[PDB]
Amino acid sequence: REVQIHLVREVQEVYRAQGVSIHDKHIEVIVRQMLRRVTIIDSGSTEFLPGSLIDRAEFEAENRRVVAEGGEPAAGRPVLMGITKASLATDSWLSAAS
């Protein structure tokens, strides 16, 4: 939350200086998309390659399944991604093919 708030304020400062007013709602909509993924430090009982970006909700579901099975959770840390990398890793193949 702290880094998200910092990003919103920092973007807003440029437009405030220049003289264009943009409500922070719009900036927050994008910034939510920026911080929607985690990174894996160690695999363990999970089948996740180290250094692989992963969806947050899917990671939590996988951990919920692996602890129920009896496997230790993977080392998952939230990570910020640039817009380019964030957009490159979509889900549907028909969209990603373009």
From Swiss-Prot:
Induction: 6-fold repressed by starvation. Belongs to the RNA polymerase beta' chain family. The RNAP catalytic core consists of 2 alpha, 1 beta, 1 beta' and 1 omega subunit. When a sigma factor is associated with the core the holoenzyme is formed, which can initiate transcription. DNA-dependent RNA polymerase catalyzes the transcription of DNA into RNA using the four ribonucleoside triphosphates as substrates. This is DNA-directed RNA polymerase subunit beta'. The chain holds residues 1128 to 1225 of 1316 of the full protein.
